[PDB]
Design an enzyme around this catalytic site. Structure first.
Site, PDB file in Angstrom:
ATOM      1  N   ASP A   1       0.801  -1.260   0.026  1.00  0.00           N
ATOM      2  CA  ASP A   1       0.047  -0.035  -0.157  1.00  0.00           C
ATOM      3  C   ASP A   1       0.694   1.268   0.184  1.00  0.00           C
ATOM      4  O   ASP A   1       0.398   2.217  -0.904  1.00  0.00           O
ATOM      5  CB  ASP A   1      -0.877   0.170   1.035  1.00  0.00           C
ATOM      6  CG  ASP A   1      -1.664   1.244   1.294  1.00  0.00           C
ATOM      7  OD1 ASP A   1      -2.534   1.449   0.394  1.00  0.00           O
ATOM      8  OD2 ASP A   1      -1.341   2.425   2.171  1.00  0.00           O
TER       9      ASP A   1
ATOM     10  N   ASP B   1       4.802   0.566   3.473  1.00  0.00           N
ATOM     11  CA  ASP B   1       4.469  -0.561   4.470  1.00  0.00           C
ATOM     12  C   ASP B   1       4.274  -1.639   3.469  1.00  0.00           C
ATOM     13  O   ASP B   1       4.383  -1.590   2.119  1.00  0.00           O
ATOM     14  CB  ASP B   1       3.308  -0.446   5.292  1.00  0.00           C
ATOM     15  CG  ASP B   1       1.921  -0.242   4.935  1.00  0.00           C
ATOM     16  OD1 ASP B   1       1.636   0.229   3.266  1.00  0.00           O
ATOM     17  OD2 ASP B   1       0.904  -0.503   5.504  1.00  0.00           O
TER      18      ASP B   1
ATOM     19  N   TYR C   1      -7.351   2.836   7.118  1.00  0.00           N
ATOM     20  CA  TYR C   1      -8.194   3.286   6.108  1.00  0.00           C
ATOM     21  C   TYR C   1      -9.580   3.134   6.375  1.00  0.00           C
ATOM     22  O   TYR C   1     -10.514   2.409   6.206  1.00  0.00           O
ATOM     23  CB  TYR C   1      -8.076   2.376   4.691  1.00  0.00           C
ATOM     24  CG  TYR C   1      -6.694   2.955   4.204  1.00  0.00           C
ATOM     25  CD1 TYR C   1      -6.567   4.027   2.995  1.00  0.00           C
ATOM     26  CD2 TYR C   1      -5.537   2.039   4.229  1.00  0.00           C
ATOM     27  CE1 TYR C   1      -5.481   4.353   2.699  1.00  0.00           C
ATOM     28  CE2 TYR C   1      -4.299   2.518   3.644  1.00  0.00           C
ATOM     29  CZ  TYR C   1      -4.087   3.775   2.986  1.00  0.00           C
ATOM     30  OH  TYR C   1      -3.041   3.971   2.475  1.00  0.00           O
TER      31      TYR C   1
ATOM     32  N   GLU D   1       5.793  10.557   3.360  1.00  0.00           N
ATOM     33  CA  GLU D   1       5.043   9.304   3.352  1.00  0.00           C
ATOM     34  C   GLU D   1       4.629   9.224   1.660  1.00  0.00           C
ATOM     35  O   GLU D   1       4.673  10.201   0.938  1.00  0.00           O
ATOM     36  CB  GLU D   1       3.330   9.226   3.838  1.00  0.00           C
ATOM     37  CG  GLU D   1       2.737   8.500   3.378  1.00  0.00           C
ATOM     38  CD  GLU D   1       2.640   7.017   3.823  1.00  0.00           C
ATOM     39  OE1 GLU D   1       3.744   6.740   4.463  1.00  0.00           O
ATOM     40  OE2 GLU D   1       1.570   6.293   4.019  1.00  0.00           O
TER      41      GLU D   1
END
Ligand SMILES: [Ca+2]
Ligand SMILES: [Ca+2]
Ligand SMILES: [Ca+2]
Ligand SMILES: [Zn+2]
Length: 493
Positions: free
Chosen positions: A79, A82, A236, A459
């Site tokens: 994703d 990770d 999420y 990120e």
């Protein structure tokens, strides 16, 4: 500010996140190999999966035809930085990249990047299909929407090829609603059909068949979103299913011209939603509005049939004004005209968590709107360009937020594999360059901390790069010169 090269680079983030037994065969990055291959032999039981003993007992012949007691839920993409595979954003990335390829295929071709796009889209959708367990008649029995668990996966930091931790398979069943993920996935597959129907008719037909089955499962069963405890817990959190449902329905009408899909889209379409937020994994209303508008232009341009049908369907008065492109014109006036906060540096900033992801989504919508309105750049595309140029380095830090694109690009993305480290806190240079990754972006004051452990501003994720790919193609469409050449030294298929 070379958009051809930006497009080329943008897709490499996906190669860096490929998962399963097909990565050395599909990824162009030599430092990525097969990973979490045990996903391909997930044990079929109530602990390794989240299906009940009773459900597995009654459906074993469909879930495990060969009877070896294992199922294959391998493939797809990690994703973010990770290694978990979360269904909602996985489908969002797949459909949004597909959305861009569908709109700007000419540019991918002109730049020799279409093959790369198709390899990534096939990897996304083949994963969805393998995870859709159907009986011989085509009815969906279960859909694996997630492999892994943030609670477990985030406790480790190493190359995905060496991971061995527990990776549970989470499945949607008729026993509990999962409308948002089921629909998000059906949309992607419908888009896959649209992208391959001329080029690989048989493959396109298969995608469409799976898309319709998933949509039927979503339509027929009780409505709701997949709950946190059933897999994405706080990683999420899904707001609603209606936008994903309408998104899939719109694409399915585009693919089939079966009025039933348009009727389903009109039944739940929130005409007031598009201008509010922007296209993202947790809200695809703006993308939906774009497709419904293109559908109207294609099949009902000179009459009020679709508009009046929509009013009847969402119980609005027949005299209420409805213009399918209006909600997006409002969204764009808001983003490009001073409605959304812009930094001192000139960057349109929604909020700090993945500001670049939101900005490029607006850019994509801006470029799609112009394409469908004379196919020439307007103040929207011009605005989109100013924003991409900011992200490429035209800012207070002269910082390029796409890693590996330039000497002034960020160099420490929050990504396990690229880092080559055993700890995000380790400040050493990364062992590998995560080419094309678009990081979270700068803060409200144009500042940014380029460190591997800066998980907010550095990120990276499949949803972050999704609209970014299309925006690059769209910008090349209206602003590309002969000076904009792709980088010949990059790996190729
Ligand atoms: Ca098996
Ligand atoms: Ca949603
Ligand atoms: Ca019309
Ligand atoms: Zn993997």
């Amino acid at each position: 500010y070379n958009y051809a090269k930006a497009l080329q680079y943008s897709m490499f983030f996906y190669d860096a996140n490929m998962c399963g037994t097909g990565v050395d065969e599909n990824s162009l990055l030599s430092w990525r190999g097969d990973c979490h291959v045990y996903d391909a032999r997930l044990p079929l039981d109530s602990q390794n999966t989240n299906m009940s003993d009773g459900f597995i007992s009654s459906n074993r012949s469909v879930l495990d035809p060969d009877g070896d007691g294992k199922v294959d839920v391998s493939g797809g993409f990690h994703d973010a930085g990770d290694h978990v595979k979360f269904g909602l954003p996985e489908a969002y990335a797949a459909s949004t990249v597909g959305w861009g390829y569908y709109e700007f295929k000419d540019q991918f071709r002109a730049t020799g990047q279409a093959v790369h796009a198709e390899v990534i889209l096939r990897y996304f959708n083949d994963y969805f299909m393998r995870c859709t367990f159907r009986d011989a008649s085509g009815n969906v029995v279960a859909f694996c929407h997630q492999v892994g668990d943030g609670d477990i996966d985030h406790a480790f930091w190493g190359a995905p090829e060496n991971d061995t931790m527990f990776r549970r398979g989470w499945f949607i069943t008729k026993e509990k609603p999962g409308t948002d993920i089921i629909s998000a996935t059906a949309a992607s597959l419908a888009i896959n059909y649209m992208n391959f129907k001329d080029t690989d008719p048989q493959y396109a037909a298969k995608s469409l068949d799976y898309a319709k089955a998933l949509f039927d499962f979503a339509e027929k069963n009780p409505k709701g979103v997949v709950q946190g405890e059933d897999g994405p817990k706080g990683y999420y959190g899904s707001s609603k299913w209606q936008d994903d449902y309408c998104w899939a329905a719109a694409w399915l009408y585009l693919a089939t011209q079966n009025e039933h899909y348009l009727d389903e889209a009109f039944k739940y379409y929130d005409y007031y939603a598009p201008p509010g937020w922007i296209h993202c994994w947790n809200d695809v209303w703006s993308g939906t509005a774009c497709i419904l508008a293109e559908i109207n232009d294609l099949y009902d341009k000179d009459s009020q049939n679709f508009e009046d049908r929509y009013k009847r369907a969402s119980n609005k008065n027949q005299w209420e004004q409805i213009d399918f492109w209006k909600p997006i014109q409002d969204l764009l006036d808001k983003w490009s005209g001073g409605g959304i906060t812009v930094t001192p540096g000139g960057y349109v900033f929604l909020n700090q968590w993945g500001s670049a992801r939101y900005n490029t989504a607006a850019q994509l919508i801006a470029l799609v709107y112009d394409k469908h309105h004379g196919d020439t750049p307007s103040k929207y595309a011009n605005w989109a360009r100013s924003q991409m140029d900011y992200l490429l380095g035209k800012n207070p830090l002269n910082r390029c937020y796409v890693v590996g694109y330039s000497s002034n690009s960020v160099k420490y993305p929050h990504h396990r594999a690229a880092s080559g480290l055993k700890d995000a806190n380790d400040s050493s240079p990364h062992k590998y360059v995560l080419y094309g990754a678009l990081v979270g972006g700068p803060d409200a004051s144009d500042q940014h901390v380029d460190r591997t452990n800066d998980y907010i501003y550095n990120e990276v994720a499949i949803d972050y790069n999704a609209a970014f790919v299309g925006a690059c193609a769209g910008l090349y469409r209206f602003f590309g010169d002969s000076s904009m050449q792709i980088d010949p030294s990059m790996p190729s298929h």
